[PDB]
Ligand binder design. Structure first.
Ligand SMILES: CCS(=O)(=O)Nc1ccccc1F
Ligand SMILES: CCS(=O)(=O)Nc1ccccc1F
Ligand SMILES: [Zn+2]
Ligand SMILES: [Zn+2]
Ligand SMILES: [Zn+2]
Length: 585
């Protein structure tokens, strides 16, 4: 028994073909079964023929005869069809409203999440369907990880390097950081975990959560988890107040945080507020400063990633009493300077998926572009708060959508929060970039911030661009552009100061090649988000949708504090780079 996800209508029916088994009301369950391939229907029992060795599960082909269910062939003389009168049979048949269109719920229930339009709908549908879609999508995502073949240690060529043997008749996952494995050792009558791991082409290079002397017969699977059902909305109902509510501002504030006092007041005058913080505009400074501006307030700092929460902890360590901080960790190495798992501490730092059920004066959800509607709902379910602050930048990178291949995901579709920021705009904006030379700020201001991002620094005159397509090679799941690495090799011989530079590309394989040939440290654009470096050398590698995504490019070039060399494939983004052009040697 439960609630019709389309009506709320009290019901005893869940669609059994739907991977999430949503409750559907006689009306909505019917309109669902007759307009899709979904025909299995679950109640207190499953609407299946209880005849001995009959394979009828279609509810349109079944009858209640006795207190048991039968097809045409097996039914008793006295029976009524389970599925008639524009309704499917079960409890609470008299209380049932239906819907004018069930189109959206069908699309969500039946889509394979490979098309952009699938994620668009999960984001523009009604709120109750945003939760359904969010569960359905995450469950699909975690089942797609089982489709992957087991990798097994066939030889241990060295340390940090392995030879893998791969399960037959199953695909192998891409070997980049976005796929995190879990090793296992071959025991008497079972298997025990041996840390999480990642891999990159060699043989294969492996960067594991722990060190070991791992040996042959050890194997690896992408660990998938149970997806719990969602209750809370992605956003609580907005409220605007006429005075700061449930928060007492400080009388004395430092000139370090004085620029955010207007914004901290806004935070107190609405139920939830959105802060767009471009690169190096001071998001974590903002988040910690709120604590000092409302000193007596209980604040739960949350984000999807351990890294994001840890970065909030690092900043907190610099400004807030340590004795008033706690880091929530469930029973990966993260921040270990606060007392661990003290829920009742004034300042709680904690990933979304580890949150305790608790209340608070403020909740700060950081790096909001990475969040999914699943994470949004979870926060609202675990944390009942006077005020919610969502800090991030919808011009930066979303969570990877492992299933998505057809279409690009626009920032207004990353989650309910980025939707608000891209349609009504953000409640608050950090409009001065402190990190980047002005040439990079001028470029991303035009490119993604509507000319509202200002440069703190001057021009470095150390921002260069080269238009060089070179030669693209493709391996199993990545791209390589050796001639673009060649151009950088040659650039470094003539400009050896740049040997302090980080190498960034949109592809892990390009990175692997560049590390051998250049020996710069390397990052994927995606791994670089939230880091800065004095000098960045960036090879676009290809002119794909991946390598031209304006959000990725934005993250790539705003990593630089002083200078950047962009070797570009795409004439479009090259022409948008407000950098010094260089000819090809
Ligand atoms: C009131 C008893 S019955 O009408 O035979 N049962 C039924 C079954 C499916 C839909 C509607 C129904 F009413
Ligand atoms: C919500 C359960 S959890 O995911 O285990 N995270 C947590 C929460 C509070 C104390 C200790 C904890 F570990
Ligand atoms: Zn269904
Ligand atoms: Zn219904
Ligand atoms: Zn039968």
């Amino acid at each position: 028994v439960g609630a019709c996800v389309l009506c709320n209508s009290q019901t005893s029916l869940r669609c059994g073909a739907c991977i999430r088994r949503p409750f559907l009301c006689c009306k909505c369950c019917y309109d669902h079964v007759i307009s899709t391939s979904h025909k299995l229907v679950l109640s207190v029992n499953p609407y299946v023929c209880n005849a001995p060795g009959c394979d009828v599960t279609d509810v349109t082909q079944l009858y209640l005869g006795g207190m048991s269910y039968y097809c045409k062939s097996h039914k008793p003389p006295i029976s009524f069809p389970l599925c008639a009168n524009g309704q499917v049979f079960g409890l609470y048949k008299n209380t049932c409203v239906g819907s004018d269109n069930v189109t959206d719920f069908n699309a969500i229930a039946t889509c394979d999440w490979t098309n952009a339009g699938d994620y668009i709908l999960a984001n523009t549908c009604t709120e109750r369907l945003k939760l359904f879609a969010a569960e359905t999508l995450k469950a699909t995502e975690e089942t797609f990880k089982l489709s992957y073949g087991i990798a097994t240690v066939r030889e241990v060529l060295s340390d940090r390097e392995l030879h893998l043997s791969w399960e037959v008749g199953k695909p192998r996952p891409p070997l980049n950081r976005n796929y995190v494995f879990t090793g296992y050792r071959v025991t008497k009558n079972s298997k025990v975990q041996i840390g999480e791991y990642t891999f990159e082409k060699g043989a294969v290079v492996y960067r594991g959560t722990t060190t070991y002397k791992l040996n042959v017969g050890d194997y690896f699977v992408l660990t998938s988890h149970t997806v719990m059902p969602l209750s809370a909305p992605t956003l609580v109902p907005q409220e605007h107040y006429v005075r700061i509510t449930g928060l007492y501002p400080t009388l004395n504030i430092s000139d370090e945080f004085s620029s955010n006092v207007a914004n901290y007041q806004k935070v107190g005058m609405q139920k939830y507020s959105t802060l767009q913080g471009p690169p190096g505009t001071g998001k974590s400074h903002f988040a910690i400063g709120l604590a000092l501006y409302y000193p007596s307030a209980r604040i739960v700092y949350t984000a999807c990633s351990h890294a994001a929460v840890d970065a909030l902890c690092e900043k907190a360590l610099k400004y807030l009493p340590i004795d008033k901080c706690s880091r929530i960790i469930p029973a990966v190495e993260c921040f270990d300077k606060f007392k661990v798992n003290s829920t009742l501490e004034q300042y709680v730092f904690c990933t979304v998926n580890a949150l305790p059920e608790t209340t608070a004066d403020i909740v700060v959800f950081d790096e909001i572009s990475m969040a999914t509607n699943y994470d949004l709902s979870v926060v609202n379910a675990r944390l009942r708060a006077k005020h919610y602050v969502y800090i991030g930048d919808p011009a930066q990178l979303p969570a990877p959508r492992t299933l998505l291949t057809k279409g690009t995901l626009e920032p207004e579709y990353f989650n309910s929060v980025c939707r608000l920021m891209k349609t009504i705009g953000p409640d608050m904006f950090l409009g001065t970039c402190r990190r980047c030379p002005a040439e990079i700020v001028d470029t991303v201001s035009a490119l993604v911030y509507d000319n509202k991002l200002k440069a703190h620094k001057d021009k470095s005159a150390q921002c260069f661009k080269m238009f060089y397509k070179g030669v693209i090679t493709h391996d199993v799941s990545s791209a390589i552009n050796r001639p673009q690495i060649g151009v950088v090799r040659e650039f470094l011989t003539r400009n050896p100061a740049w040997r302090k530079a980080v190498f960034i590309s949109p592809y892990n394989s390009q990175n692997a090649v560049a590390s051998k040939i250049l020996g710069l440290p390397t990052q994927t654009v995606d791994s670089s988000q939230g880091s800065e470096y004095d000098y960045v050398i960036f090879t676009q590698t290809t002119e794909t949708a991946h390598s031209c995504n304006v959000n990725r490019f934005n993250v790539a070039i705003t990593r630089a504090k002083v200078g950047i060399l962009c070797i570009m494939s795409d004439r479009d983004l090259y022409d948008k780079l407000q950098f010094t052009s260089l000819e090809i040697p």
